[PDB]
Amino acid sequence: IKTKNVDAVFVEKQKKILSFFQDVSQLNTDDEYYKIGKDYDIEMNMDNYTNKKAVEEFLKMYRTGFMPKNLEFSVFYDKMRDEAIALFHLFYYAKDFETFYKTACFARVHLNQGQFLYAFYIAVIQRSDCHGFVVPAPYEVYPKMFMNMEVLQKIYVTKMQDGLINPEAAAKYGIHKENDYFVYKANYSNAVLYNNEEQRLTYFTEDIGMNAYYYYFHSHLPFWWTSEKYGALKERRGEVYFYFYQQLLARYYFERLTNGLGKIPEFSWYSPIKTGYYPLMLTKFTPFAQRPDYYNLHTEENYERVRFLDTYEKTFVQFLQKDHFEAFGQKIDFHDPKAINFVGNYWQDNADLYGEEVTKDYQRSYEVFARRVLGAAPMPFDKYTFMPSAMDFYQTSLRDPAFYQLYNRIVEYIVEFKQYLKPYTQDKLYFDGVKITDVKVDKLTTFFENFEFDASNSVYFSKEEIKNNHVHDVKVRQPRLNHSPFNVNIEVDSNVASDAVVKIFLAPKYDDNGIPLTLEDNWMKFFELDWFTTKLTAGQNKIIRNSNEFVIFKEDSVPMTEIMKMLDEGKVPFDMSEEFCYMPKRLMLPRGTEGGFPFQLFVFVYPFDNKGKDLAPFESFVLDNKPLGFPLDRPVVDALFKVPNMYFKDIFIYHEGERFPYKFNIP
């Protein structure tokens, strides 16, 4: 739908990129990438990389040996990570497109496909020549990680059988051929297993968009890499960390509310953890590890891990006990809101915490080991051989209740810091002579709709079938949440011509007992929907803002084949070219109820720095230096806070149509 135009030169480059996301598990020896790949000599091309040191390091490490082709790559393990990072450096410091391309061809040919794709996807994102380029949605690149094993197996069965043996029989199982695609209907995990109440939320926690979303978040801004590239953004890194989780968690909490599930559970490393996770997914070697209910974190195997983790926390508790201290070669003062940077970087243990370009093995990650122990897997066999859990991958992390429980813990500690900050005062927040006299919102209505994604990358083909470009294409379809578009009409009385910023937040109305929600202690349950600017004339004004224009969300990724068609028309998708790392639009609202679950909308209008000139979106945010999530980035005091340029509207989220996703999947 929303597109953008592109010259034949961009087209050739884009198709070259996408060729690496096409048949990922296998090698076409006839194909151009293979000829290039097989014999390409990095050493002879040394002067075609910006950074000799990087390439040397790569050749060293590579001649030493990388991970093998049959294993499962995860970034959370040292040696694999380092291999990946070196490969990435290689892609990144390539002189030009051509060399980068030749470098990929090599790596595709010579290396573990998981490692390669991790590296490449990030390089494409992070390279400056490649800004403007497009990467396929992660569920197409790694489809095996966006579906339960039931479906995956059905796919393999159908392929072994070279088609359906009894079409009518297959239809009972949600399998049918549609033109030259085989289509699998896919149920969420709780259609087959309801082990605890968390399964109530599967349509969210398993939603291929939510998971892809987290995968983008990491890809844009990996914990091991410095934010150097982004210049000024670097000094805000910590801020972005906290914001991302605090937002995600708020959105998650909304889902919880509408399923009658309340606040996110706390755990202790010295105690068993009540909430299990039974992953219904596997790998060519092993199944993902399961965590039974009341799994005891404190066993022989974890004793040392727990020590480390306990210390990592106690250390931050000590920071909170002083207000000003020296850590990691910086001098920190918790009265300073800019210290959020340090705090965010502390918890993520990222490159910017130290002054470095990449993290080092001895700089041990709290998140890595939290994930590792929460994951409940047995100890890895060797460095390349471990039992995967959902927290070994960004594609799968959102699937485990424990994920939210972990980041909840971290975020909470970060707000323990936020308490140091002076609450915004009356006269910091006032917009003199402007008043929001009314807010009116359209119908807020959620629903489910079937969605298909191309899952072909999961299918293995034959020597003979590959040269024949024989087609066995696979689509997986499942109900995914969506909502109807809606308008927010804001009526404001500006005394005077002024330029304003309008901000829109969604928040809960009551807690799960009907206690109405007070800002004083519920400010962090506010989810930001929109940020925009408006000319405000004297007298009466009215802004109309449509949920499609909301800046914080994106449209669904277009499939590769569709992107591929658009390229022949000098076209490319807009949203995928620029706006990929945002939350998908359909998920903005939690699942409402047939009778209208109560939330509230917080509209806030405040003075914009004129510019004296015309305005464009991206730099317009950077010109006003308000902290992310303003004015709800720190504790509020209700009475000191409320003001005429604020408005709170009680709203109701309805749901229409079929309420349970499995009803779509009925034979």
Ligand X SMILES: *[C@@H]1O[C@H](CO)[C@@H](O[C@@H]2O[C@H](CO)[C@@H](O[C@@H]3O[C@H](CO[C@H]4O[C@H](CO)[C@@H](O)[C@H](O)[C@@H]4O)[C@@H](O)[C@H](O[C@H]4O[C@H](CO)[C@@H](O)[C@H](O)[C@@H]4O)[C@@H]3O)[C@H](O)[C@H]2NC(C)=O)[C@H](O)[C@H]1NC(C)=O
Site string for ligand X, 604-643 (x = CB under 6 A): ----------------------------------------
Closest residue to Na ion in the complex (CB): 408
Q: Which one of 50, 51, 268, 296 is in contact with other proteins (CB under 8 A)?
A: 296
Q: Which of residues 82-111 bind other proteins (CB under 8 A)?
A: none
Burial state string for 138-175 with b = 16 or more CB within 10 A and e = fewer than 16:
bbbbbbbbbbbebbbebbeebbeeeebeeeeebeeebb
Biggest distance spanned by C-alpha atoms of the chain: 76
Cβ 198 to Na ion, closest distance in Å? 13
Region near ligand X per CB under 6 A, out of 207-215, 502-510, 568-576, 659-667: 659-667
Dist. CA 233–CA 418, nearest whole Å: 20
Quick one: what does residue 266 bind among Na ion, ligand X, other proteins, none, with the CB cut-off 5 to 8 Å set by partner type? Na ion
C-beta of 294: minimal distance to other proteins in Å? 5
Q: What are phi and psi of 424, to 5 degrees?
A: -55, 135
Q: How far is the CB of 378 from other proteins (least distance, A)?
A: 4
Structure tokens belonging to residue 450? 């079937």
Stretch that binds other proteins, among 189-197, 399-407, 431-439, 540-548 (CB under 8 A): 189-197
Applying the rule CB under 8 A, the residues between 378 and 417 that interact with other proteins are: 378-381, 385-387
| Nearer to other proteins among residue 289 and residue 429 (C-beta) | 289
Which CB atom, from 266 or from 638, has the smaller least distance to Na ion?
A: 266
Report the distance separating Cα 540 and Cα 549, nearest Å: 23
Given Na ion, ligand X, other proteins, none, residue 443, with its beta carbon under 5 to 8 Å by kind, binds none
Handedness of CA 489, 494, 499, 502 (dihedral sign): negative
Q: Are 195 and 293 contacting, i.e. CB atoms less than 8 angstroms apart?
A: yes
- What whole-number distance in Å separates Cα of residue 140 and Cα of residue 455? 6
> What does the alpha-carbon distance between residue 532 and residue 603 come to, in Å, rounded to a whole number?
11
| Long-range contacts of the stretch 345-350 (C-beta < 8 A, 24+) | 345/237, 345/238, 345/241, 346/238, 346/316, 346/319, 347/241, 347/316, 347/410, 347/413, 347/414, 348/223, 348/238, 348/241, 349/223, 350/223, 350/224, 350/237
Q: Per rule CB under 6 A, is residue 174 in the interface with ligand X?
A: yes
> In this structure, what token pair is assigned to residue 200?
């109530």
> Interacting stretch for other proteins, rule CB under 8 A, among 59-67, 165-173, 310-318, 553-561?
165-173
Answer yes or no whether residue 166 interacts with ligand X by CB under 6 A: no
Q: How far apart are CA 613 and CA 523, in angstroms?
A: 35
d(CA 83, CA 66): 7
Residue 360 CA to residue 349 CA, distance in Å, equals 10
Q: Which of 6, 459, 529, 560 binds other proteins (CB under 8 A)?
A: 459
Closer to other proteins at the Cβ: 328 or 460?
Answer: 460
**235: which 2 tokens?**
């000094």
CB of 135 to Na ion, least distance (A): 33
Q: Which residues pair with 342 in a beta bridge?
A: none
If contact means CB under 5 to 8 A according to the sort of partner, which of Na ion, ligand X, other proteins, none does residue 387 touch? other proteins
* Total binding residues toward ligand X, as defined by CB under 6 A: 11
409 touches Na ion (CB under 5 A):
yes
Whole-angstrom distance, CA of residue 200 vs CA of residue 399: 12
Contact 449, 480 (CB under 8 A): yes
Options 287, 355, 516, 657; binder of other proteins; rule CB under 8 A = 287
Nearer to other proteins, 292 or 423 (CB): 292
Q: Is 405 near Na ion (CB under 5 A)?
A: yes
Q: Which is nearer to ligand X, 108 or 185 (CB)?
A: 185
185 near ligand X, judged by CB under 6 A: yes
CA 418 vs CA 242, 411, 438: distances in Å: 11, 10, 32
Q: Does 665 bind other proteins (CB under 8 A)?
A: no
- Rank residues 184 and 461 by Cβ distance to ligand X and give the closer one: 184
Beta-carbon contacts of residue 233 (< 8 Å; ≥ 6 apart): 227, 240
Q: How far is the CB of 66 from ligand X (least distance, A)?
A: 7
What is the 8-class DSSP label of residue 165? S
> For binding to Na ion (CB under 5 A), which residues are involved?
266, 405, 408-409
- Interface with other proteins (CB under 8 A): 26-27, 29, 70, 149-150, 153, 156-157, 159-163, 165-166, 173, 192-195, 272, 278-282, 284-290, 292-296, 299-301, 376, 378-381, 385-387, 459-465
Binding site for ligand X (CB under 6 A): 65, 68, 172, 174, 185, 187, 191, 662, 665-667
